Amino acid sequence: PHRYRPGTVALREIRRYQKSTELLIRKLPFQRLVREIAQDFKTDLRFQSSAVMALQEASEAYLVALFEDTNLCAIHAKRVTIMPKDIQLARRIRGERA
């Protein structure tokens, strides 16, 4: 039975996704999330499809860049595993929540 060691596939995945540009979150699920949040602010709203896509392109770009800063906080702590305190430290320094 063949088995790659832990971390090998993860690295394979990194090269894979850093090489492509397609969205990583499923389309329809993201769409329902946007409609749910908007709805809690104002009922009877409609969305141009491109408005939903503009939101998904901004959201994914924001999360990817966030994970980069988070990776740097983990590494700063002698770790290779990101944790909630890494995300929290990256957002505090970013000024997203003093």
Partner: protein
């Protein structure tokens, strides 16, 4: 009747730029030199990014510049990267980059 772009030796539309300036309410008056200068700068910059993007397109064996090529050209250029540091290019992805410590063996 030559176009003001022609008079200026520019590709970008000087008359349009002068018009957009007035419509934008940036000041009460817009001097005739303003749009010429501005159209030139805009042209220079789109030339700078298209130069680099066309290179990224060739390096990827492509003939058509797509968003990923614009992102590669911008993030790989110190200055364009700074000018567009708070800008997100749709479908651009990111630059291949893996922190050393994450690589296997020694």
């Amino acid at each position: 009747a030559k176009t003001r772009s022609s008079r200026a030796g520019l590709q970008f539309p000087v008359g349009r730029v002068h018009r957009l300036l007035r419509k934008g309410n940036y000041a009460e008056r817009v001097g005739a030199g303003a749009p010429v200068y501005l159209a030139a700068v805009l042209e220079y910059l789109t030339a700078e990014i298209l130069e680099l993007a066309g290179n990224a397109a060739r390096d990827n064996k492509k003939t058509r510049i797509i968003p990923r090529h614009l992102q590669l050209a911008v993030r790989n250029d110190e200055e364009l990267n700074k000018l567009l540091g708070r800008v997100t290019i749709a479908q651009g992805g990111v630059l291949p980059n893996i922190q050393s410590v994450l690589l296997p063996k020694k």
